[PDB]
């Protein structure tokens, strides 16, 4: 049987339910394991305490180092299924109106996913580094992004070194800016969120973000992206306005025991058996409300396995930082 690395109560509680139902038609077996963080869930796989967990590719980095050397097995299928893709798009989606284009972007203010995060943190400040002015280390890129921003949201950061990388999080009491689901503003939904209460200028996300949140029509009319060119176009042309293609979010698992074979084919059956529009009782890819993304990535289709030995830092593609 496969333990699963759950990352809160929440995600606890879908994979409790992921165990009831994979019992109810008979297929391989899943357990979960709870601990708090993605990098607290890799060190668990790690320690033979737990077997897989889907981590975003700047979490797939930090997991194939040492002394974990833990290895992508399952890439997430997103989009349809008459294009699937195993990639999503960076973009900045910002509030429609505004004459600031990428270039521009200094003194604003900043709405990101998470600290180290793919498309919230390491494409745009990737893409922001000539504009940034940054000596380099043994002084964090944190330092700079401080005192780029007037102010943001970037939660993991350190809320006495960077105080206004936390500045626009809404997390109440000692809760603000932390890497959890309880900062209302973590994550993509919580990154798209701080820009839809008003409290950035910038919100750097995936393409399916505002197709995602925003259900009606009318709505998402009054979002743009920012282009890389400068310029800024409608939040449904993504494929010609984007920061980055960064590989999906995958299941990573150890490199000597890792179960490979037979977490890939929990995850094959339950992607028959409660994909999307599969079983009315469980959507392996659905989370209730409020709650988002939770142990996968809500309308993502499917999987697609990764070839034999494929590290970690190959599977990101080369041209990374
Ligand atoms: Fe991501």
């Given at each position: 049987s496969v333990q699963w690395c759950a990352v809160s109560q929440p995600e606890a509680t879908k994979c409790f339910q992921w165990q009831r139902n994979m019992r109810r038609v008979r297929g391989p077996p899943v357990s979960c394991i709870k601990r708090d963080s993605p990098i607290q869930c890799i060190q668990a796989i790690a320690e033979n305490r737990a077997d897989a967990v889907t981590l975003d590719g700047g979490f797939i980095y930090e997991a194939g180092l040492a002394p974990y050397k833990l290895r992508p097995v399952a890439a997430e299928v997103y989009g349809t299924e008459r294009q699937p893709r195993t990639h999503y798009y960076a973009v900045a989606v910002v509030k429609k109106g505004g004459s600031f284009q990428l270039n521009e972007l200094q003194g604003l203010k900043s709405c990101h996913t998470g600290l180290r995060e793919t498309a919230g943190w390491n494409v745009p400040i990737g893409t922001l580094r000539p504009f940034l002015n940054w000596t380099g280390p043994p002084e964090p890129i944190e330092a700079a992004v401080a005192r780029f921003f007037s102010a943001s949201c970037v939660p993991g950061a350190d809320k006495g070194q960077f105080?206004?990388?936390?500045?626009?999080?809404?997390?109440?009491?000692?809760?603000?800016?932390?890497?959890?689901?309880?900062?209302?503003?973590?994550?993509?939904?919580?990154?798209?969120?701080?820009?839809?209460?008003?409290?950035?200028?910038?919100?750097?996300?995936?393409?399916?973000?505002?197709?995602?949140?925003?259900?009606?029509?009318?709505?998402?009319?009054?979002?743009?992206?920012?282009?890389?060119?400068?310029?800024?176009?409608?939040?449904?042309?993504?494929?010609?306005?984007?920061?980055?293609?960064?590989?999906?979010?995958?299941?990573?698992?150890?490199?000597?025991?890792?179960?490979?074979?037979?977490?890939?084919?929990?995850?094959?059956?339950?992607?028959?058996?409660?994909?999307?529009?599969?079983?009315?009782?469980?959507?392996?890819?659905?989370?209730?409300?409020?709650?988002?993304?939770?142990?996968?990535?809500?309308?993502?289709?499917?999987?697609?396995?990764?070839?034999?030995?494929?590290?970690?830092?190959?599977?990101?593609?080369?041209?990374?930082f």
């Open positions: 105080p206004n990388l936390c500045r626009l999080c809404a997390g109440t009491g000692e809760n603000k800016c932390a890497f959890s689901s309880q900062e209302p503003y973590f994550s993509y939904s919580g990154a798209f969120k701080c820009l839809r209460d008003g409290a950035g200028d910038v919100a750097f996300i995936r393409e399916s973000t505002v197709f995602e949140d925003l259900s009606d029509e009318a709505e998402r009319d009054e979002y743009e992206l920012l282009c890389p060119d400068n310029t800024r176009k409608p939040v449904d042309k993504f494929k010609d306005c984007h920061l980055a293609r960064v590989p999906s979010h995958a299941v990573v698992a150890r490199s000597v025991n890792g179960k490979e074979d037979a977490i890939w084919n929990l995850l094959r059956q339950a992607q028959e058996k409660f994909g999307k529009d599969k079983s009315p009782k469980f959507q392996l890819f659905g989370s209730p409300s409020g709650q988002k993304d939770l142990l996968f990535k809500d309308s993502a289709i499917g999987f697609s396995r990764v070839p034999p030995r494929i590290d970690s830092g190959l599977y990101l593609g080369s041209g990374y």
